[PDB]
Amino acid sequence: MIEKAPTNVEDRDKAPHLLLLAGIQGDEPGGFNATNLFLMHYSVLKGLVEVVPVLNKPSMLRNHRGLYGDMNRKFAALDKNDPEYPTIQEIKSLIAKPSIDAVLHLHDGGGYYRPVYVDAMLNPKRWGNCFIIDQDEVKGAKFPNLLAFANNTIESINAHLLHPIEEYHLKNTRTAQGDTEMQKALTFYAINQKKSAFANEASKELPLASRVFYHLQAIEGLLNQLNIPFKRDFDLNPNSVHALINDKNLWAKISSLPKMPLFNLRPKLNHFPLPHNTKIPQIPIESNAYIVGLVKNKQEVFLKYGNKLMTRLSPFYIEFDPSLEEVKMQIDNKDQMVKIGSVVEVKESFYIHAMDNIRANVIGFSVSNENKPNEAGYTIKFKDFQKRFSLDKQERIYRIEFYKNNAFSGMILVKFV
Ligand SMILES: [Ca+2]
Ligand SMILES: [Ca+2]
Ligand SMILES: [Ca+2]
Protein backbone atom coordinates (compact mmCIF):
# COMPACT_ATOMS: atom_id res chain seq x y z
CA MET A 1 0.00 0.00 0.00
CA ILE A 2 1.20 3.48 -1.01
CA GLU A 3 -0.39 6.61 0.48
CA LYS A 4 -1.49 9.59 -1.57
CA ALA A 5 -1.75 12.16 1.21
CA PRO A 6 -1.87 15.92 1.84
CA THR A 7 1.42 17.56 2.62
CA ASN A 8 0.14 18.58 6.02
CA VAL A 9 -0.57 15.51 8.12
CA GLU A 10 -3.32 17.41 9.90
CA ASP A 11 -5.35 17.51 6.68
CA ARG A 12 -5.68 13.70 6.59
CA ASP A 13 -8.77 13.61 8.78
CA LYS A 14 -10.49 16.58 7.09
CA ALA A 15 -12.08 14.53 4.26
CA PRO A 16 -12.91 10.87 3.61
CA HIS A 17 -10.44 8.07 2.92
CA LEU A 18 -10.58 5.90 -0.14
CA LEU A 19 -8.82 2.61 -0.73
CA LEU A 20 -8.01 2.27 -4.45
CA LEU A 21 -6.96 -1.16 -5.76
CA ALA A 22 -6.17 -2.77 -9.12
CA GLY A 23 -4.45 -5.72 -10.71
CA ILE A 24 -6.21 -8.54 -8.87
CA GLN A 25 -5.94 -10.19 -12.30
CA GLY A 26 -2.43 -9.88 -13.76
CA ASP A 27 -3.60 -9.44 -17.36
CA GLU A 28 -5.83 -6.42 -16.75
CA PRO A 29 -3.37 -3.59 -17.38
CA GLY A 30 -5.91 -0.75 -17.64
CA GLY A 31 -6.45 -1.02 -13.89
CA PHE A 32 -2.82 -1.13 -12.80
CA ASN A 33 -1.64 1.49 -15.27
CA ALA A 34 -4.39 3.75 -13.88
CA THR A 35 -3.29 3.20 -10.27
CA ASN A 36 0.29 3.82 -11.46
CA LEU A 37 -0.53 7.14 -13.15
CA PHE A 38 -2.62 8.15 -10.14
CA LEU A 39 0.35 7.58 -7.80
CA MET A 40 2.78 9.35 -10.14
CA HIS A 41 0.75 12.35 -11.27
CA TYR A 42 -2.04 13.19 -8.83
CA SER A 43 -2.12 15.04 -5.52
CA VAL A 44 -4.65 14.60 -2.72
CA LEU A 45 -5.24 17.78 -0.73
CA LYS A 46 -7.48 16.71 2.16
CA GLY A 47 -8.42 13.21 3.31
CA LEU A 48 -6.36 10.29 2.03
CA VAL A 49 -6.23 7.84 -0.85
CA GLU A 50 -4.52 4.55 0.00
CA VAL A 51 -3.45 2.72 -3.15
CA VAL A 52 -2.51 -0.89 -3.78
CA PRO A 53 -1.50 -0.39 -7.41
CA VAL A 54 -1.23 -4.13 -8.22
CA LEU A 55 -2.87 -6.76 -6.00
CA ASN A 56 -1.42 -9.78 -7.82
CA LYS A 57 2.12 -8.77 -8.72
CA PRO A 58 3.49 -12.26 -9.51
CA SER A 59 0.70 -12.71 -12.03
CA MET A 60 1.23 -9.26 -13.51
CA LEU A 61 4.92 -10.09 -14.09
CA ARG A 62 3.85 -13.11 -16.16
CA ASN A 63 0.98 -11.31 -17.97
CA HIS A 64 -1.35 -13.85 -16.40
CA ARG A 65 -4.86 -13.70 -15.02
CA GLY A 66 -3.80 -15.50 -11.82
CA LEU A 67 -0.86 -17.86 -11.30
CA TYR A 68 -2.51 -19.21 -8.14
CA GLY A 69 -6.08 -19.17 -9.46
CA ASP A 70 -8.57 -16.31 -9.28
CA MET A 71 -7.40 -14.14 -6.37
CA ASN A 72 -10.80 -12.37 -6.52
CA ARG A 73 -12.58 -15.58 -5.48
CA LYS A 74 -10.59 -15.78 -2.23
CA PHE A 75 -12.40 -13.31 0.10
CA ALA A 76 -14.81 -15.80 1.64
CA ALA A 77 -13.90 -19.40 2.43
CA LEU A 78 -10.15 -19.88 2.02
CA ASP A 79 -7.72 -22.68 2.88
CA LYS A 80 -5.06 -21.47 5.33
CA ASN A 81 -2.46 -23.15 3.09
CA ASP A 82 -3.51 -21.30 -0.10
CA PRO A 83 -0.41 -19.60 -1.49
CA GLU A 84 -2.26 -16.26 -1.57
CA TYR A 85 -3.66 -16.58 1.97
CA PRO A 86 -1.11 -14.13 3.51
CA THR A 87 -1.77 -11.58 0.72
CA ILE A 88 -5.53 -11.92 1.16
CA GLN A 89 -5.23 -11.19 4.88
CA GLU A 90 -3.14 -8.06 4.23
CA ILE A 91 -5.82 -6.84 1.77
CA LYS A 92 -8.75 -7.63 4.07
CA SER A 93 -6.99 -5.78 6.90
CA LEU A 94 -6.62 -2.69 4.70
CA ILE A 95 -10.27 -2.88 3.64
CA ALA A 96 -11.58 -3.26 7.17
CA LYS A 97 -9.50 -0.44 8.77
CA PRO A 98 -11.77 2.01 10.63
CA SER A 99 -10.05 4.92 8.86
CA ILE A 100 -11.20 3.64 5.43
CA ASP A 101 -14.60 4.86 4.21
CA ALA A 102 -14.80 3.75 0.59
CA VAL A 103 -13.20 1.14 -1.68
CA LEU A 104 -12.74 1.35 -5.46
CA HIS A 105 -11.57 -1.77 -7.28
CA LEU A 106 -10.45 -1.48 -10.93
CA HIS A 107 -10.84 -4.26 -13.55
CA ASP A 108 -10.61 -4.66 -17.29
CA GLY A 109 -13.52 -6.71 -18.73
CA GLY A 110 -14.61 -8.15 -22.08
CA GLY A 111 -17.10 -6.54 -24.43
CA TYR A 112 -19.47 -3.83 -23.20
CA TYR A 113 -22.01 -4.42 -20.47
CA ARG A 114 -25.60 -3.52 -21.36
CA PRO A 115 -28.61 -4.06 -19.08
CA VAL A 116 -30.57 -5.62 -21.99
CA TYR A 117 -29.26 -8.10 -24.56
CA VAL A 118 -28.21 -6.14 -27.68
CA ASP A 119 -25.76 -8.64 -29.25
CA ALA A 120 -22.83 -11.00 -28.42
CA MET A 121 -20.54 -8.05 -27.68
CA LEU A 122 -23.11 -5.87 -25.86
CA ASN A 123 -25.24 -7.65 -23.27
CA PRO A 124 -25.88 -8.11 -19.51
CA LYS A 125 -23.26 -10.90 -19.27
CA ARG A 126 -20.42 -8.74 -20.59
CA TRP A 127 -18.30 -6.61 -18.28
CA GLY A 128 -16.72 -3.72 -20.14
CA ASN A 129 -17.38 -0.08 -19.26
CA CYS A 130 -19.65 -0.36 -16.32
CA PHE A 131 -19.59 0.81 -12.74
CA ILE A 132 -20.57 -1.89 -10.33
CA ILE A 133 -22.18 -2.07 -6.90
CA ASP A 134 -23.11 -5.17 -4.86
CA GLN A 135 -26.38 -3.59 -3.61
CA ASP A 136 -27.96 -0.13 -3.51
CA GLU A 137 -27.41 0.71 0.16
CA VAL A 138 -24.97 -0.29 2.90
CA LYS A 139 -26.54 0.60 6.25
CA GLY A 140 -23.94 1.85 8.73
CA ALA A 141 -21.37 3.06 6.19
CA LYS A 142 -20.25 6.72 6.29
CA PHE A 143 -21.86 6.98 2.82
CA PRO A 144 -24.65 4.37 2.76
CA ASN A 145 -26.18 5.40 -0.58
CA LEU A 146 -24.03 3.39 -2.96
CA LEU A 147 -26.62 3.80 -5.74
CA ALA A 148 -26.58 7.62 -5.64
CA PHE A 149 -22.80 7.63 -5.56
CA ALA A 150 -22.65 5.19 -8.47
CA ASN A 151 -25.17 7.10 -10.58
CA ASN A 152 -23.33 10.36 -10.01
CA THR A 153 -19.93 8.79 -10.83
CA ILE A 154 -21.42 7.37 -14.04
CA GLU A 155 -22.63 10.92 -14.94
CA SER A 156 -19.09 12.18 -14.63
CA ILE A 157 -17.64 9.41 -16.80
CA ASN A 158 -20.37 9.79 -19.44
CA ALA A 159 -19.58 13.51 -19.84
CA HIS A 160 -16.26 12.42 -21.43
CA LEU A 161 -17.04 9.55 -23.81
CA LEU A 162 -14.62 9.02 -26.68
CA HIS A 163 -17.26 7.09 -28.70
CA PRO A 164 -20.94 6.42 -27.91
CA ILE A 165 -20.41 2.64 -27.66
CA GLU A 166 -18.28 3.31 -24.59
CA GLU A 167 -21.24 4.72 -22.57
CA TYR A 168 -21.10 3.59 -18.95
CA HIS A 169 -24.04 1.84 -17.24
CA LEU A 170 -24.80 0.90 -13.68
CA LYS A 171 -24.49 -2.77 -12.85
CA ASN A 172 -25.95 -3.84 -9.51
CA THR A 173 -24.98 -7.47 -9.00
CA ARG A 174 -27.34 -7.94 -6.00
CA THR A 175 -24.61 -10.12 -4.54
CA ALA A 176 -26.25 -11.01 -1.23
CA GLN A 177 -29.28 -12.50 -3.06
CA GLY A 178 -27.15 -14.61 -5.42
CA ASP A 179 -25.40 -17.98 -5.11
CA THR A 180 -22.59 -18.69 -2.58
CA GLU A 181 -20.17 -18.86 -5.54
CA MET A 182 -20.93 -15.23 -6.45
CA GLN A 183 -20.03 -13.91 -2.98
CA LYS A 184 -16.28 -14.54 -2.93
CA ALA A 185 -15.05 -11.21 -4.29
CA LEU A 186 -13.36 -8.15 -2.89
CA THR A 187 -16.15 -5.55 -2.99
CA PHE A 188 -18.65 -7.85 -1.26
CA TYR A 189 -16.15 -8.41 1.54
CA ALA A 190 -15.84 -4.61 1.78
CA ILE A 191 -19.57 -3.95 2.06
CA ASN A 192 -19.73 -6.57 4.84
CA GLN A 193 -17.34 -4.30 6.79
CA LYS A 194 -19.73 -1.37 6.25
CA LYS A 195 -17.54 0.28 3.64
CA SER A 196 -19.03 1.83 0.50
CA ALA A 197 -17.50 -0.27 -2.25
CA PHE A 198 -17.46 0.02 -6.03
CA ALA A 199 -15.79 -1.71 -8.93
CA ASN A 200 -14.97 -0.02 -12.20
CA GLU A 201 -14.64 -2.06 -15.38
CA ALA A 202 -12.90 -0.73 -18.48
CA SER A 203 -13.50 -2.65 -21.70
CA LYS A 204 -10.73 -5.00 -22.90
CA GLU A 205 -11.89 -4.02 -26.40
CA LEU A 206 -10.21 -0.62 -25.87
CA PRO A 207 -6.55 0.20 -26.40
CA LEU A 208 -4.59 0.52 -23.13
CA ALA A 209 -4.57 4.34 -23.09
CA SER A 210 -8.37 4.44 -23.45
CA ARG A 211 -8.87 1.82 -20.71
CA VAL A 212 -6.70 3.91 -18.43
CA PHE A 213 -8.61 7.06 -19.46
CA TYR A 214 -11.91 5.51 -18.31
CA HIS A 215 -10.42 4.23 -15.05
CA LEU A 216 -9.10 7.71 -14.31
CA GLN A 217 -12.53 9.20 -15.10
CA ALA A 218 -14.12 6.77 -12.61
CA ILE A 219 -11.50 7.60 -9.94
CA GLU A 220 -12.14 11.34 -10.44
CA GLY A 221 -15.91 10.89 -10.46
CA LEU A 222 -15.83 9.00 -7.18
CA LEU A 223 -13.36 11.39 -5.50
CA ASN A 224 -15.73 14.20 -6.45
CA GLN A 225 -18.67 12.35 -4.82
CA LEU A 226 -16.62 11.71 -1.68
CA ASN A 227 -15.48 15.35 -1.60
CA ILE A 228 -11.82 14.30 -1.51
CA PRO A 229 -10.13 17.29 -3.21
CA PHE A 230 -7.36 16.46 -5.69
CA LYS A 231 -5.25 17.76 -8.54
CA ARG A 232 -3.44 16.22 -11.44
CA ASP A 233 -0.49 17.57 -13.39
CA PHE A 234 -1.73 16.72 -16.91
CA ASP A 235 -4.79 16.98 -19.18
CA LEU A 236 -6.99 13.88 -19.14
CA ASN A 237 -7.36 12.77 -22.76
CA PRO A 238 -6.14 9.59 -24.45
CA ASN A 239 -3.10 11.25 -26.02
CA SER A 240 -1.99 12.60 -22.74
CA VAL A 241 -2.55 9.32 -20.97
CA HIS A 242 -0.57 7.54 -23.70
CA ALA A 243 2.29 10.00 -23.28
CA LEU A 244 2.50 9.33 -19.55
CA ILE A 245 2.27 5.52 -19.88
CA ASN A 246 5.05 5.74 -22.45
CA ASP A 247 7.09 8.41 -20.64
CA LYS A 248 10.76 8.63 -21.70
CA ASN A 249 11.52 9.94 -18.19
CA LEU A 250 10.57 6.63 -16.60
CA TRP A 251 13.49 4.75 -15.09
CA ALA A 252 14.36 1.64 -13.11
CA LYS A 253 17.23 1.09 -10.72
CA ILE A 254 18.28 -2.52 -10.15
CA SER A 255 20.24 -3.17 -6.92
CA SER A 256 23.07 -0.59 -6.61
CA LEU A 257 23.35 -0.14 -10.41
CA PRO A 258 22.66 3.27 -12.05
CA LYS A 259 19.12 4.35 -13.01
CA MET A 260 18.32 3.08 -16.53
CA PRO A 261 15.61 4.42 -18.84
CA LEU A 262 12.63 2.02 -19.07
CA PHE A 263 11.76 2.73 -22.68
CA ASN A 264 14.03 2.23 -25.69
CA LEU A 265 16.44 -0.14 -23.98
CA ARG A 266 17.83 -2.75 -26.32
CA PRO A 267 15.59 -5.84 -26.08
CA LYS A 268 18.50 -7.85 -24.66
CA LEU A 269 21.29 -6.76 -22.34
CA ASN A 270 24.18 -9.24 -22.06
CA HIS A 271 26.64 -10.13 -19.28
CA PHE A 272 24.49 -8.08 -16.98
CA PRO A 273 25.78 -8.02 -13.37
CA LEU A 274 23.31 -9.19 -10.67
CA PRO A 275 24.01 -9.98 -7.04
CA HIS A 276 24.69 -13.62 -6.36
CA ASN A 277 22.90 -15.67 -3.74
CA THR A 278 19.81 -13.52 -4.16
CA LYS A 279 16.46 -14.81 -5.38
CA ILE A 280 15.19 -12.68 -8.27
CA PRO A 281 12.07 -11.37 -6.47
CA GLN A 282 14.38 -10.26 -3.59
CA ILE A 283 16.72 -8.15 -5.77
CA PRO A 284 16.07 -4.48 -4.91
CA ILE A 285 14.34 -2.54 -7.64
CA GLU A 286 13.41 1.15 -7.53
CA SER A 287 11.44 3.17 -10.07
CA ASN A 288 9.54 6.41 -10.43
CA ALA A 289 6.70 4.10 -11.51
CA TYR A 290 4.95 1.68 -9.10
CA ILE A 291 4.38 -1.35 -11.36
CA VAL A 292 7.96 -2.25 -12.30
CA GLY A 293 9.61 -5.56 -11.39
CA LEU A 294 11.98 -8.39 -12.30
CA VAL A 295 10.97 -11.92 -13.14
CA LYS A 296 13.02 -15.00 -14.11
CA ASN A 297 12.25 -16.59 -17.49
CA LYS A 298 14.37 -19.64 -18.18
CA GLN A 299 17.89 -18.32 -17.48
CA GLU A 300 17.04 -14.70 -18.41
CA VAL A 301 15.64 -12.05 -16.10
CA PHE A 302 12.87 -9.87 -17.57
CA LEU A 303 12.41 -6.20 -16.65
CA LYS A 304 8.67 -5.68 -16.60
CA TYR A 305 6.64 -2.46 -16.50
CA GLY A 306 3.11 -3.72 -15.95
CA ASN A 307 2.65 -6.22 -18.80
CA LYS A 308 5.27 -4.53 -20.97
CA LEU A 309 8.62 -6.28 -21.45
CA MET A 310 11.27 -3.52 -21.29
CA THR A 311 14.38 -5.72 -21.69
CA ARG A 312 15.66 -9.26 -21.22
CA LEU A 313 18.71 -9.39 -18.97
CA SER A 314 21.22 -12.15 -19.56
CA PRO A 315 22.79 -12.11 -16.12
CA PHE A 316 26.02 -13.11 -14.60
CA TYR A 317 25.88 -13.56 -10.89
CA ILE A 318 28.68 -12.03 -8.84
CA GLU A 319 29.46 -10.67 -5.39
CA PHE A 320 28.50 -6.99 -5.17
CA ASP A 321 31.35 -5.59 -3.06
CA PRO A 322 30.09 -2.22 -1.76
CA SER A 323 33.53 -0.75 -0.82
CA LEU A 324 33.95 1.46 -3.90
CA GLU A 325 31.93 4.65 -3.41
CA GLU A 326 33.28 6.96 -6.08
CA VAL A 327 35.76 7.09 -8.95
CA LYS A 328 38.01 9.91 -10.18
CA MET A 329 36.97 10.66 -13.78
CA GLN A 330 37.66 13.39 -16.28
CA ILE A 331 34.52 14.43 -18.17
CA ASP A 332 34.84 16.78 -21.15
CA ASN A 333 38.32 17.71 -19.88
CA LYS A 334 36.90 18.42 -16.40
CA ASP A 335 38.29 16.25 -13.60
CA GLN A 336 35.79 15.20 -10.91
CA MET A 337 34.67 12.50 -8.48
CA VAL A 338 31.80 10.38 -9.84
CA LYS A 339 29.66 8.32 -7.47
CA ILE A 340 29.32 4.62 -8.22
CA GLY A 341 25.75 4.14 -9.46
CA SER A 342 25.70 7.50 -11.30
CA VAL A 343 24.73 8.44 -14.80
CA VAL A 344 27.09 11.06 -16.27
CA GLU A 345 26.45 13.13 -19.39
CA VAL A 346 29.33 13.39 -21.88
CA LYS A 347 29.52 15.91 -24.72
CA GLU A 348 32.96 14.96 -26.11
CA SER A 349 35.18 12.65 -24.04
CA PHE A 350 35.87 10.94 -20.76
CA TYR A 351 38.89 9.42 -19.02
CA ILE A 352 39.02 7.17 -15.97
CA HIS A 353 42.01 7.77 -13.66
CA ALA A 354 43.88 4.61 -12.72
CA MET A 355 43.12 3.03 -9.32
CA ASP A 356 45.01 0.68 -7.05
CA ASN A 357 43.11 -2.60 -6.79
CA ILE A 358 40.25 -1.58 -9.15
CA ARG A 359 39.91 -2.61 -12.80
CA ALA A 360 37.55 -0.70 -15.17
CA ASN A 361 35.86 -2.32 -18.13
CA VAL A 362 34.18 0.18 -20.44
CA ILE A 363 31.57 -1.98 -22.22
CA GLY A 364 31.82 -1.25 -25.92
CA PHE A 365 35.37 0.04 -25.81
CA SER A 366 38.45 -2.13 -26.22
CA VAL A 367 42.17 -1.90 -26.98
CA SER A 368 42.84 -5.65 -27.07
CA ASN A 369 41.13 -9.05 -26.91
CA GLU A 370 41.92 -9.45 -23.18
CA ASN A 371 39.01 -11.14 -21.37
CA LYS A 372 39.38 -9.12 -18.15
CA PRO A 373 40.72 -5.74 -19.39
CA ASN A 374 41.69 -2.57 -17.47
CA GLU A 375 40.59 0.42 -19.45
CA ALA A 376 41.37 3.13 -16.93
CA GLY A 377 43.92 5.56 -18.40
CA TYR A 378 42.32 5.94 -21.84
CA THR A 379 40.78 9.07 -23.31
CA ILE A 380 37.54 7.77 -24.77
CA LYS A 381 35.19 9.41 -27.30
CA PHE A 382 31.95 8.33 -29.05
CA LYS A 383 33.84 7.14 -32.15
CA ASP A 384 35.75 4.65 -29.95
CA PHE A 385 32.59 2.65 -29.14
CA GLN A 386 31.23 -0.44 -30.88
CA LYS A 387 27.62 0.87 -30.85
CA ARG A 388 26.11 -2.62 -30.56
CA PHE A 389 27.17 -2.60 -26.88
CA SER A 390 25.00 0.42 -25.95
CA LEU A 391 22.32 -0.01 -23.29
CA ASP A 392 19.87 1.91 -25.48
CA LYS A 393 18.41 1.61 -28.95
CA GLN A 394 19.65 5.20 -29.57
CA GLU A 395 23.28 4.02 -29.12
CA ARG A 396 24.10 6.85 -26.66
CA ILE A 397 24.37 5.08 -23.26
CA TYR A 398 27.31 2.84 -22.26
CA ARG A 399 28.21 0.85 -19.13
CA ILE A 400 31.45 1.22 -17.20
CA GLU A 401 31.94 -1.75 -14.89
CA PHE A 402 34.40 -1.84 -12.01
CA TYR A 403 35.95 -4.96 -10.50
CA LYS A 404 38.01 -5.71 -7.40
CA ASN A 405 39.60 -9.12 -7.92
CA ASN A 406 36.68 -11.44 -8.74
CA ALA A 407 34.02 -9.17 -7.18
CA PHE A 408 31.89 -6.48 -8.82
CA SER A 409 32.61 -3.00 -7.43
CA GLY A 410 29.85 -1.14 -9.29
CA MET A 411 28.69 0.53 -12.48
CA ILE A 412 28.56 4.07 -13.86
CA LEU A 413 26.71 4.92 -17.08
CA VAL A 414 27.95 7.45 -19.61
CA LYS A 415 25.35 9.10 -21.83
CA PHE A 416 26.62 10.86 -24.94
CA VAL A 417 24.54 14.02 -25.46
CA1 LIG B 1 3.41 14.21 -13.59
CA1 LIG C 1 -11.24 -8.93 -13.60
CA1 LIG D 1 35.94 -2.91 -22.70
Numbering used by the authors: 22 to 438
Task: Please quote the paper that reports this structure.
Csd4 has been identified as one of the cell shape-determining peptidoglycan hydrolases in H. pylori. Csd4 is a Zn2+-dependent d,l-carboxypeptidase (d,l-CPase) which cleaves the γ-d-Glu2-mDAP3 bond of the non-cross-linked peptidoglycan muramyltripeptide (muramyl-l-Ala1-γ-d-Glu2-mDAP3) to produce the corresponding muramyl­dipeptide (muramyl-l-Ala-γ-d-Glu) and mDAP. H. pylori Csd4 consists of three domains: an N-terminal CPase domain (residues 22–267), a central β-barrel domain with a novel fold (residues 268–340) and a C-terminal immunoglublin-like domain (residues 341–438).
To provide the structural basis for understanding the molecular function of H. pylori Csd4, we have determined its crystal structure in three different states: (i) a ligand-free form (Csd4-unbound), (ii) a substrate-bound form (Csd–muramyltripeptide) complexed with the synthetic peptidoglycan fragment NAM-tripeptide (NAM-l-Ala-γ-d-Glu-mDAP) and (iii) a product-bound form (Csd4–mDAP) complexed with mDAP, one of the two products. Since the crystallization reservoir solution contained calcium chloride, we have assigned the three metal ions as Ca2+. Therefore, our crystallized enzyme with a Ca2+ ion in the active site is a noncompetent variant. This region is moved towards the active site in the Csd4–muramyltripeptide and Csd4–mDAP structures when we compare them with Csd4-unbound. The side chain of Arg94 interacts with the flap via a strong salt bridge with Glu202 in all three structures. It points towards the active site in both the Csd4–muramyltripeptide and Csd4–mDAP structures, whereas it points away from the active site in the Csd4-unbound structure.
